[PDB]
Amino acid sequence: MKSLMKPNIKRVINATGVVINTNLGRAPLSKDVINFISEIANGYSNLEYNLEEGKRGSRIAHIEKYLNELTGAESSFVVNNNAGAVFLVLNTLAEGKEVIISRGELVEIGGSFRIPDIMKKSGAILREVGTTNKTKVSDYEGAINQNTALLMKVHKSNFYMEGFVEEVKLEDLVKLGHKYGIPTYYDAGSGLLINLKEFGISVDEPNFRDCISLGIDLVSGSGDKLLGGPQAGIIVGKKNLIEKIKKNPIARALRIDKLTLSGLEMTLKLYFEKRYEDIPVIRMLTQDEKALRQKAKRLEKLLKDIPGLKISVIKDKAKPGGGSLPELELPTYCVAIRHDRLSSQELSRRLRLAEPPIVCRIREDQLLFDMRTVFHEDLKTIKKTLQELLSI
Amino acid sequence: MKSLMKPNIKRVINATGVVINTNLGRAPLSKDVINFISEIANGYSNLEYNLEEGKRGSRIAHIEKYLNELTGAESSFVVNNNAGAVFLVLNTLAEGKEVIISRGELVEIGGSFRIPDIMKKSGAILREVGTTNKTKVSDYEGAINQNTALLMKVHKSNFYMEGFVEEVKLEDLVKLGHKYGIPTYYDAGSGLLINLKEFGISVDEPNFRDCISLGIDLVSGSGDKLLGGPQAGIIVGKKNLIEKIKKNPIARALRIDKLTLSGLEMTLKLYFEKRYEDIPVIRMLTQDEKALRQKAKRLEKLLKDIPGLKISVIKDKAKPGGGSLPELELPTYCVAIRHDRLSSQELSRRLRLAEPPIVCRIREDQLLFDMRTVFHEDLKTIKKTLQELLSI
Amino acid sequence: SLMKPNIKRVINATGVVINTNLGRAPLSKDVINFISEIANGYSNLEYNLEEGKRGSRIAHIEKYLNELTGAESSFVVNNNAGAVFLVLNTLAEGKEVIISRGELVEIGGSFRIPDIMKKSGAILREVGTTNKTKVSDYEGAINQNTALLMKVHKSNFYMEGFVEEVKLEDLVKLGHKYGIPTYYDAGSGLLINLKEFGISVDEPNFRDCISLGIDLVSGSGDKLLGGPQAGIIVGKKNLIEKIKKNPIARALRIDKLTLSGLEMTLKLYFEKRYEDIPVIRMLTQDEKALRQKAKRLEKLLKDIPGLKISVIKDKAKPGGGSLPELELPTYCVAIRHDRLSSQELSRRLRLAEPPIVCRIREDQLLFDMRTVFHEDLKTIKKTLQELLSI
Ligand SMILES: [K+]
Ligand SMILES: [K+]
């Protein structure tokens, strides 16, 4: 067409202050990682080749070692996404047999992924216990039978519940699973690699290393979330299970590509090297209450001149994680702006059609810019784009 | 581990002359493409955001307008890999129902992908017809029944047969398909986008545009083969079928990643722009017989001075496509070497262990460098590595 | 401990108006004297003075219900639990009932939707996800056996994040299209719109939900209705009659007390005396009226030795059983003591005569004033000094 002249996929300025943003492409990547991906993809590589033996070799093989070490699992595996990892795990272990799960955990993440729908297409039988808000242990145990193949737990990533609510301590499931000799599978989904409380964020958000040490047979999660990697189905646990999973032919359709594989490796390397500030998602969530102010007012300083603009700086409690930490509320600083000639709604609309475009949160005709998600070289382009729409 | 300090994924000089090489990571990507991927991954984007509506939209969206226009198909879709495409098509259309395909088309490509084995895990019931070598139309038709959902043909990318062999022309399948009101599915696999004869290579190799205007209902293929794109399952055909496929839960687990999607988009943009020289595979396969020599002797000029080196330049016919054009042979220029002090075999193993490493063809204790697969900036790297090993 | 009653009056300093543990809605003294009068001797419980013969007890109430909800008819059983059980078992025995996966709730310890729907004899057809449920989920599960389209309201909890819910509007449409009836378990027993009282919320009520075309609606008496314990059902005549006719309805029959109390509560409603029903008063109390009451307490506690007293402004949640989402501004009277830890102070406050139940944060004992009566205060002081200074 003539709308195919210029690419439809384009870089976007996130002013929503939502670190994990489903709509905006989730975790962005460090320039360190990306030059590595670029480097790998510019020409040929050792992808499925073992240079030592001069023959073809497993492409997953290196990535695994990282995960095995960082996380502590017996073994591991990686596929296209977590969605597939779930599907793969189910289809491999639970075909035609029962899978027990809480009525509180049967979740739709995104538009196209529904636990029960994919479990059906998985060829597994869903056995749902407890209630929406509350689920005891007696619920999981009571549903065990000759045909129970799997005890599964899903972590509610994109919503939370408050009020009267009960949940089952993972410790309990694993106890149950030993008693009846049923394996425990945990879709964590955020793919948090290590404990959050290390970095100054106080939350009960589960991770690989810790859940592994709990005794959960299998755990999966996304690469592109709290792990701040490329899109990836990350699976870790007991050797005999992973081996069974790898053996499944479906795993071939779910096989990760050169780019993600490399970008992932690099991401993992950073983790071993303990370079947390070099993965953008972690950085953005661990930023200092003052740093946000410092970056907030530097924008106001660039916005005062423009005609017709009332600018304020506010301090607010907002939720920072969209896809990963729904309960989390953190203090941050937003630059609020209002215009005489135009409503905020017509202002956000124009901000979306800009080049480059800018997406911002909105509260009662107060256009807001959360600085948690804003880069330093974004400021310059924000000003330039604000003056071009109104000073045209 | 000790070797975890450094990534195992490293760029590899390809001296094999094998453009599509499974072990070397299939298609390399043009710099223009990688920059766009880079650009996109650097920060937040419109991946799952529709800027015009200011709400979530699908990622697949951006690409499809391109595929449509280029292929001539009614609509299209993209998934992780062609393996997934095949799997997704079968599960979507053929679950619990019979699929007819030739006994000569039931392929294993690579180590992990087997048509019969995937199709079984597909949930689709394999109706095999005809013989390995010979398969007539009557074979196809004869096996049609109330339970026949699908008429499938797979292209034999990785092998061929000689002697007494017969096959069904596609026109015919389409005909049979109209007759019984059953849909025709063709896995090309090589995902060649357009006609090869335009580029000076005379082969009957199938492509999307052509196979669509023959009246095939669904066609799939890999992105990183003869399309020269990133790893992707590429599916094009009738709207009603695509819709059905899209709506499959499993499609979510087959969803392509941010990187490929963007890389893909750029790949297509170049195609639309008819800028073929900028797509590394095509260039490599269209290179002038003369250009080869020009690059070949340019390396020799660099190797004369190095001690103990017997350098020659030879003309040969070797097979350039690894995973796509198995019967094809093309004229090419290898720069062959031998050393008095070292055996070529000990030379090749050292070459594999270099930084960056070098994979080459061996013939009769003579080292060959096929120039078809060799970049201009590799030469300098070659020279520097040869002298560092030999003259040290 | 048979030598004195195990049940006792209790001072709620929790600031939670609907409180499961503390007895839910307290009753207006107007109401309670009416209950008293009736129960003092014989009455026209099941008797028609005009015709000189037997007549039904639920009679008295239902005129009231029908008018205030606008429904064709109504019925009242022991508690909403039974109401739900009764409706399901009457309408859906052996048949399928469609319900969102988000609405299958445990309210309290002993009441679970799926469990009771099981023992109901109804067949549970669950659709959608925990977080999200669309219309197509509901529609798609409709078949020859589908007896009932059921929505349950999440009273004792809520969800935030990515959430999707089915407009009641849409359900009633669905139910007309396939000619299935729609059953809404509100649970809170909100009778009329909240935004009339200055509370801005989408909280569903009988009147509003009846006018939407829901065939049946149930709720508890002792929640946002501020009445005694009661299963309250309103809707279509055909359906109420089927229900009243269930022989189980007779096991779920309300008593003379709750009947009496309930009728008087309703009188109040028709007479538009909202301020005379504790629960509504307590949630509609003015932000300064809480200070005014908070600092009148302080003034009583200054003299007592060893007490550090302050007065704070906070955002807490007022409804325990009914409005789980609602945070409202309120004033707490906070207190510390040098000798005793807050923890040990709390435990002593609960062993008091009369006892006192209060919130706790970080070694700062709090009294929320939202749930405390004027005559409570004198008794607070009198009991604080008797513990600390004994
Ligand atoms: K991928
Ligand atoms: K009763």
Coordinates of C-alpha atoms in Angstrom, one line a residue, chain C residues 51-261:
Chain C
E51 CA -61.2 -13.6 58.6
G52 CA -60.8 -15.2 62.1
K53 CA -58.6 -17.9 60.7
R54 CA -54.9 -18.9 59.9
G55 CA -52.8 -16.6 57.6
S56 CA -49.2 -16.6 56.5
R57 CA -46.3 -14.9 58.4
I58 CA -44.4 -13.7 55.3
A59 CA -47.6 -11.9 54.3
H60 CA -46.8 -8.9 56.5
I61 CA -43.4 -8.2 55.1
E62 CA -43.9 -8.7 51.4
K63 CA -46.2 -5.8 50.6
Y64 CA -43.3 -3.7 51.7
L65 CA -40.7 -5.5 49.7
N66 CA -42.6 -5.4 46.5
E67 CA -43.2 -1.7 46.7
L68 CA -39.6 -0.7 47.6
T69 CA -37.9 -3.1 45.1
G70 CA -40.7 -2.7 42.5
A71 CA -40.7 -6.5 42.0
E72 CA -43.8 -8.5 41.1
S73 CA -43.4 -10.5 44.4
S74 CA -41.1 -11.6 47.2
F75 CA -40.3 -14.2 49.9
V76 CA -38.2 -14.4 53.1
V77 CA -36.3 -17.3 54.5
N78 CA -33.8 -17.8 57.4
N79 CA -30.7 -16.4 55.7
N80 CA -29.3 -15.6 52.2
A81 CA -27.5 -18.9 52.3
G82 CA -30.8 -20.8 52.2
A83 CA -32.2 -18.2 49.8
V84 CA -29.6 -19.2 47.3
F85 CA -29.9 -22.9 48.2
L86 CA -33.7 -22.6 47.9
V87 CA -33.7 -20.9 44.5
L88 CA -31.2 -23.3 43.0
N89 CA -32.9 -26.4 44.3
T90 CA -36.3 -25.2 43.3
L91 CA -35.4 -23.8 39.8
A92 CA -32.3 -25.8 38.8
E93 CA -32.5 -29.3 40.2
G94 CA -30.8 -31.8 37.9
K95 CA -30.2 -28.9 35.4
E96 CA -27.3 -26.6 34.5
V97 CA -26.5 -23.2 36.1
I98 CA -24.2 -20.8 34.3
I99 CA -21.8 -18.8 36.5
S100 CA -18.6 -16.8 36.1
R101 CA -15.4 -18.3 37.4
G102 CA -14.8 -14.9 39.1
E103 CA -18.1 -15.1 41.1
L104 CA -17.8 -18.5 42.8
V105 CA -17.2 -17.3 46.3
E106 CA -16.6 -18.4 49.9
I107 CA -18.3 -16.0 52.2
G108 CA -17.6 -16.9 55.8
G109 CA -16.2 -20.3 56.8
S110 CA -19.1 -22.6 56.0
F111 CA -20.6 -21.1 52.9
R112 CA -19.2 -22.0 49.5
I113 CA -21.1 -21.4 46.2
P114 CA -19.9 -24.5 44.4
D115 CA -20.4 -26.7 47.5
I116 CA -23.9 -25.5 48.1
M117 CA -24.8 -25.6 44.4
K118 CA -23.6 -29.3 44.6
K119 CA -25.9 -30.1 47.6
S120 CA -28.5 -28.0 45.9
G121 CA -29.0 -30.7 43.3
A122 CA -28.1 -28.1 40.6
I123 CA -25.5 -28.7 38.0
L124 CA -22.8 -26.0 38.0
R125 CA -21.6 -24.7 34.6
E126 CA -18.7 -22.4 35.2
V127 CA -17.4 -20.0 32.5
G128 CA -14.7 -17.4 31.8
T129 CA -11.6 -16.9 34.0
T130 CA -10.9 -15.8 37.5
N131 CA -9.9 -12.3 36.5
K132 CA -11.9 -11.8 33.3
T133 CA -15.2 -13.1 31.9
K134 CA -16.9 -11.9 28.7
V135 CA -20.5 -12.3 27.3
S136 CA -19.5 -15.0 24.8
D137 CA -18.4 -17.1 27.8
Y138 CA -21.9 -17.0 29.3
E139 CA -23.7 -17.4 25.9
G140 CA -21.5 -20.3 24.7
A141 CA -22.4 -22.5 27.6
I142 CA -26.2 -22.3 27.1
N143 CA -27.8 -25.5 26.1
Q144 CA -30.9 -27.7 26.4
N145 CA -30.2 -28.3 30.1
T146 CA -29.5 -24.7 31.1
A147 CA -32.0 -23.8 33.8
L148 CA -30.5 -20.6 35.1
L149 CA -28.3 -17.6 34.5
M150 CA -26.6 -16.7 37.8
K151 CA -24.5 -13.8 39.0
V152 CA -23.0 -13.6 42.5
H153 CA -21.8 -10.3 43.8
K154 CA -18.3 -10.2 45.4
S155 CA -19.3 -8.8 48.8
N156 CA -16.4 -9.9 51.0
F157 CA -13.6 -9.2 48.6
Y158 CA -12.7 -7.5 45.3
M159 CA -10.2 -7.6 42.5
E160 CA -8.0 -5.0 40.9
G161 CA -5.7 -5.1 38.0
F162 CA -6.8 -6.5 34.7
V163 CA -10.4 -7.4 35.3
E164 CA -13.5 -8.0 33.2
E165 CA -17.0 -8.6 34.3
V166 CA -20.4 -9.1 32.5
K167 CA -22.8 -6.2 32.5
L168 CA -26.1 -7.3 34.2
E169 CA -27.7 -5.4 31.3
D170 CA -26.1 -8.0 29.0
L171 CA -27.1 -11.0 31.0
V172 CA -30.8 -10.1 31.0
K173 CA -30.5 -9.6 27.2
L174 CA -28.9 -13.1 27.0
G175 CA -31.7 -14.5 29.2
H176 CA -34.4 -13.1 27.0
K177 CA -32.8 -14.3 23.8
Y178 CA -32.6 -17.9 25.1
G179 CA -35.5 -17.6 27.4
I180 CA -33.6 -18.5 30.5
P181 CA -34.2 -16.7 33.8
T182 CA -31.5 -14.6 35.5
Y183 CA -30.7 -14.9 39.2
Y184 CA -28.6 -12.3 41.0
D185 CA -27.2 -12.9 44.5
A186 CA -26.4 -9.4 45.6
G187 CA -25.8 -10.6 49.2
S188 CA -25.4 -7.2 50.7
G189 CA -29.1 -6.6 50.5
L190 CA -28.7 -3.0 49.4
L191 CA -32.3 -1.9 49.0
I192 CA -32.0 1.4 47.2
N193 CA -29.3 3.5 45.4
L194 CA -26.3 4.6 47.4
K195 CA -25.6 7.8 45.5
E196 CA -28.8 9.1 47.2
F197 CA -27.0 9.2 50.5
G198 CA -23.8 10.9 49.3
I199 CA -21.8 7.7 48.8
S200 CA -20.5 7.5 45.2
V201 CA -20.3 3.8 44.2
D202 CA -21.6 1.4 41.6
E203 CA -22.9 -0.9 44.4
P204 CA -26.0 -2.9 43.1
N205 CA -29.3 -2.8 45.0
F206 CA -32.7 -4.4 44.9
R207 CA -34.8 -1.6 43.4
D208 CA -32.2 -0.7 40.7
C209 CA -31.5 -4.4 39.9
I210 CA -35.2 -5.2 39.6
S211 CA -35.8 -2.4 37.2
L212 CA -33.0 -3.9 35.0
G213 CA -35.0 -7.0 34.3
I214 CA -33.3 -9.5 36.6
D215 CA -35.8 -12.3 37.2
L216 CA -34.7 -13.0 40.8
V217 CA -32.6 -11.2 43.3
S218 CA -31.5 -12.3 46.9
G219 CA -29.6 -10.7 49.7
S220 CA -29.0 -10.8 53.5
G221 CA -31.1 -8.8 55.9
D222 CA -28.3 -8.1 58.4
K223 CA -25.9 -6.4 56.0
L224 CA -26.3 -3.2 54.0
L225 CA -30.0 -3.5 54.8
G226 CA -29.3 -3.1 58.5
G227 CA -32.0 -5.6 59.3
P228 CA -32.0 -8.8 61.2
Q229 CA -30.7 -12.1 59.7
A230 CA -32.8 -12.8 56.7
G231 CA -32.7 -14.5 53.3
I232 CA -34.4 -11.9 51.1
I233 CA -35.7 -12.9 47.7
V234 CA -37.5 -10.7 45.2
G235 CA -38.7 -11.1 41.6
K236 CA -41.1 -12.7 39.2
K237 CA -44.4 -14.1 40.6
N238 CA -44.2 -17.5 38.8
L239 CA -40.8 -18.0 40.3
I240 CA -41.5 -16.9 43.9
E241 CA -44.5 -19.2 43.9
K242 CA -42.4 -22.1 42.7
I243 CA -40.0 -21.3 45.5
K244 CA -42.6 -20.8 48.3
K245 CA -44.0 -24.1 47.2
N246 CA -40.7 -26.0 47.9
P247 CA -41.1 -28.2 51.0
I248 CA -37.6 -27.1 52.0
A249 CA -38.8 -23.5 52.4
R250 CA -40.5 -24.8 55.5
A251 CA -37.1 -25.8 57.0
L252 CA -35.8 -22.3 56.2
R253 CA -38.8 -20.4 57.7
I254 CA -37.9 -17.2 59.6
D255 CA -38.9 -16.8 63.2
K256 CA -41.2 -14.4 65.1
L257 CA -38.3 -12.2 66.2
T258 CA -36.6 -11.7 62.8
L259 CA -40.0 -11.3 61.2
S260 CA -41.1 -8.6 63.7
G261 CA -37.7 -6.9 63.5

